[PDB]
Write an enzyme that holds these catalytic residues in place. Structure first.
Site, PDB file in Angstrom:
ATOM      1  N   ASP A   1      -1.905 127.582 -72.090  1.00 52.88           N
ATOM      2  CA  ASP A   1      -1.828 126.528 -73.101  1.00 52.88           C
ATOM      3  C   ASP A   1      -1.730 127.095 -74.537  1.00 52.88           C
ATOM      4  O   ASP A   1      -1.160 126.555 -75.500  1.00 52.88           O
ATOM      5  CB  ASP A   1      -3.118 126.012 -73.194  1.00 52.88           C
ATOM      6  CG  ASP A   1      -3.736 125.345 -71.966  1.00 52.88           C
ATOM      7  OD1 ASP A   1      -4.587 124.581 -71.772  1.00 52.88           O
ATOM      8  OD2 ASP A   1      -2.923 125.771 -70.880  1.00 52.88           O
TER       9      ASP A   1
ATOM     10  N   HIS B   1     -23.426 136.851 -90.829  1.00 53.14           N
ATOM     11  CA  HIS B   1     -22.645 137.149 -89.641  1.00 53.14           C
ATOM     12  C   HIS B   1     -23.268 136.948 -88.256  1.00 53.14           C
ATOM     13  O   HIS B   1     -22.808 136.205 -87.288  1.00 53.14           O
ATOM     14  CB  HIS B   1     -21.844 138.341 -89.765  1.00 53.14           C
ATOM     15  CG  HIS B   1     -20.638 138.427 -88.836  1.00 53.14           C
ATOM     16  ND1 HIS B   1     -20.473 138.783 -87.473  1.00 53.14           N
ATOM     17  CD2 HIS B   1     -19.234 138.216 -89.032  1.00 53.14           C
ATOM     18  CE1 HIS B   1     -19.478 138.915 -86.891  1.00 53.14           C
ATOM     19  NE2 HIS B   1     -18.550 138.426 -88.100  1.00 53.14           N
TER      20      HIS B   1
ATOM     21  N   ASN C   1      -9.618 141.901 -85.620  1.00 54.85           N
ATOM     22  CA  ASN C   1      -8.685 140.958 -86.283  1.00 54.85           C
ATOM     23  C   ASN C   1      -7.776 141.797 -87.183  1.00 54.85           C
ATOM     24  O   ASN C   1      -7.617 141.618 -88.648  1.00 54.85           O
ATOM     25  CB  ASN C   1      -9.726 140.215 -87.436  1.00 54.85           C
ATOM     26  CG  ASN C   1     -11.105 139.865 -86.845  1.00 54.85           C
ATOM     27  OD1 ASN C   1     -11.049 139.082 -86.044  1.00 54.85           O
ATOM     28  ND2 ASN C   1     -12.291 140.226 -87.484  1.00 54.85           N
TER      29      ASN C   1
ATOM     30  N   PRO D   1     -12.084 148.985 -70.779  1.00 52.90           N
ATOM     31  CA  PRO D   1     -11.610 148.375 -69.618  1.00 52.90           C
ATOM     32  C   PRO D   1     -12.421 147.396 -68.984  1.00 52.90           C
ATOM     33  O   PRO D   1     -12.407 146.147 -68.676  1.00 52.90           O
ATOM     34  CB  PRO D   1     -10.739 149.098 -68.797  1.00 52.90           C
ATOM     35  CG  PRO D   1     -11.353 150.507 -69.187  1.00 52.90           C
ATOM     36  CD  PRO D   1     -11.597 150.495 -70.634  1.00 52.90           C
TER      37      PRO D   1
ATOM     38  N   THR E   1      -8.943 120.463 -71.523  1.00 52.56           N
ATOM     39  CA  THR E   1      -7.484 121.028 -71.016  1.00 52.56           C
ATOM     40  C   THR E   1      -6.526 120.965 -71.868  1.00 52.56           C
ATOM     41  O   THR E   1      -5.293 120.866 -71.883  1.00 52.56           O
ATOM     42  CB  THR E   1      -7.328 120.649 -69.632  1.00 52.56           C
ATOM     43  OG1 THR E   1      -6.512 119.394 -69.876  1.00 52.56           O
ATOM     44  CG2 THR E   1      -8.304 120.400 -68.815  1.00 52.56           C
TER      45      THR E   1
ATOM     46  N   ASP F   1      -8.892 140.009 -72.188  1.00 50.14           N
ATOM     47  CA  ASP F   1      -9.262 139.439 -70.822  1.00 50.14           C
ATOM     48  C   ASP F   1      -9.149 138.003 -71.022  1.00 50.14           C
ATOM     49  O   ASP F   1      -8.900 137.392 -69.904  1.00 50.14           O
ATOM     50  CB  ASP F   1     -10.596 140.039 -70.604  1.00 50.14           C
ATOM     51  CG  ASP F   1     -10.772 141.470 -70.412  1.00 50.14           C
ATOM     52  OD1 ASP F   1     -10.129 142.181 -69.487  1.00 50.14           O
ATOM     53  OD2 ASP F   1     -11.438 142.011 -71.090  1.00 50.14           O
TER      54      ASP F   1
ATOM     55  N   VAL G   1     -15.417 145.753 -70.136  1.00 47.81           N
ATOM     56  CA  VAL G   1     -16.107 144.783 -70.579  1.00 47.81           C
ATOM     57  C   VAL G   1     -14.884 143.742 -70.828  1.00 47.81           C
ATOM     58  O   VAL G   1     -13.826 143.863 -70.531  1.00 47.81           O
ATOM     59  CB  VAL G   1     -16.815 145.078 -71.915  1.00 47.81           C
ATOM     60  CG1 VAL G   1     -17.863 146.288 -71.722  1.00 47.81           C
ATOM     61  CG2 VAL G   1     -15.798 145.703 -73.013  1.00 47.81           C
TER      62      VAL G   1
ATOM     63  N   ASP H   1     -25.418 142.449 -83.742  1.00 47.09           N
ATOM     64  CA  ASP H   1     -24.723 142.123 -85.201  1.00 47.09           C
ATOM     65  C   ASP H   1     -25.625 142.454 -86.223  1.00 47.09           C
ATOM     66  O   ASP H   1     -26.241 143.590 -86.248  1.00 47.09           O
ATOM     67  CB  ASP H   1     -24.570 140.556 -85.200  1.00 47.09           C
ATOM     68  CG  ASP H   1     -22.939 140.069 -84.779  1.00 47.09           C
ATOM     69  OD1 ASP H   1     -21.978 140.994 -85.281  1.00 47.09           O
ATOM     70  OD2 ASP H   1     -22.643 139.194 -84.201  1.00 47.09           O
TER      71      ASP H   1
ATOM     72  N   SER I   1     -14.733 137.771 -83.805  1.00 54.14           N
ATOM     73  CA  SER I   1     -16.103 137.826 -83.863  1.00 54.14           C
ATOM     74  C   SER I   1     -16.641 136.456 -83.817  1.00 54.14           C
ATOM     75  O   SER I   1     -17.925 136.330 -83.361  1.00 54.14           O
ATOM     76  CB  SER I   1     -16.464 138.430 -85.253  1.00 54.14           C
ATOM     77  OG  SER I   1     -15.631 138.241 -86.337  1.00 54.14           O
TER      78      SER I   1
END
Length: 279
Positions: free
Chosen positions: A260, A69, A161, A175, A16, A200, A177, A39, A224
């Site tokens: 946070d 990657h 990014n 929306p 936390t 999300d 996923v 990927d 990613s």
């Protein structure tokens, strides 16, 4: 169970507060679940996967991750030392070339494959898909991830990014996923991380140490890199029966460290993926 001196992102999604070093997780560690890493491929021969990685489909001449990657994100999902769900199954779906680029037709075909291929696998705890990729807005890419999600697969994608609103990017803008943004080790939004209403959740995505091709390691950054943290968490929480594939994005947001994060633009959620592990 604890992993000392873990990657900062592993320690973050068990804490936390930032700055810690130990990753606290339940010993089941995603056993019985599968994560499809869509990927550049996976170097399943990497000793960090312990044979729990395998390529299931490529769209190029070889299934070799000649980029790194994909091996990185599979590592963040379920590698022994750098992964969240340390006992999960890893399935590689090479839709990105060894340059890390891929056409939409190939990416959509890859999601359709995972939607059907999962019926050939033993994933009793459920199926997860980590999509560390994405280009401009496309309705065809969006609907593919929705199809995959609708078929019973927890689909987690990168917000991108571009440091913009993610609504102009696919499959980020779909929306249904889980769109994952990136933070850094100081609980700031990543300089590059996309934002917007569609996002999300946020995951550790700056300076992520994980597996790399050639049995090596590497530290890179990107949404990613945040996406496999969340995909691995969802797979972990599904092995615990805490959520389901259709709910896992909502569950992870419901149980995330609220507030946070700093530099979260107005309108974007302020949630950091958090496994809420209590010894």
């Amino acid at each position: 169970a604890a992993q000392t001196n873990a990657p900062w992102g592993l320690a973050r999604i068990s804490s936390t507060s930032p700055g810690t070093s130990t990753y606290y997780y339940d010993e089941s560690a995603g056993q019985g679940s599968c994560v499809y890493v869509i990927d550049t491929g996976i170097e399943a021969s990497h000793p960090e996967f312990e044979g729990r990685a395998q390529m299931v489909k490529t769209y190029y001449y070889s299934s070799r991750d000649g980029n790194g990657h994909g091996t990185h994100c599979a590592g963040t999902v379920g590698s022994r030392t750098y992964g969240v769900a340390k006992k999960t199954q890893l399935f590689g779906v090479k839709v990105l070339d060894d340059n890390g680029s891929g056409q939409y037709s190939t990416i959509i075909a890859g999601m359709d494959f995972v939607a059907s291929d999962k019926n050939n696998r033993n994933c009793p705890k459920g199926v997860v898909a980590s999509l560390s990729l994405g280009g401009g807005y496309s309705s065809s890419v969006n609907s593919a991830a929705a199809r995959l999600q609708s078929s019973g697969v927890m689909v987690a994608v990168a917000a991108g990014n571009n440091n913009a609103d993610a609504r102009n990017y696919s499959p980020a803008s779909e929306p249904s996923v889980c769109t994952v943004g990136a933070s850094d080790r100081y609980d700031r939004r990543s300089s590059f991380s996309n934002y917007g209403s569609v996002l999300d959740i946020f995951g550790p995505g700056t300076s992520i140490l994980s597996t790399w091709i050639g049995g090596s390691t590497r530290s890179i950054s990107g949404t990613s890199m945040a996406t496999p943290h969340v995909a691995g968490l969802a797979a972990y929480l599904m092995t615990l029966g805490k959520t389901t594939a259709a709910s896992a994005c909502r569950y992870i947001a419901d149980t995330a460290n609220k507030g946070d994060l700093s530099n979260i633009p107005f309108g974007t959620v302020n949630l950091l993926a958090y496994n809420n592990y209590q010894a």
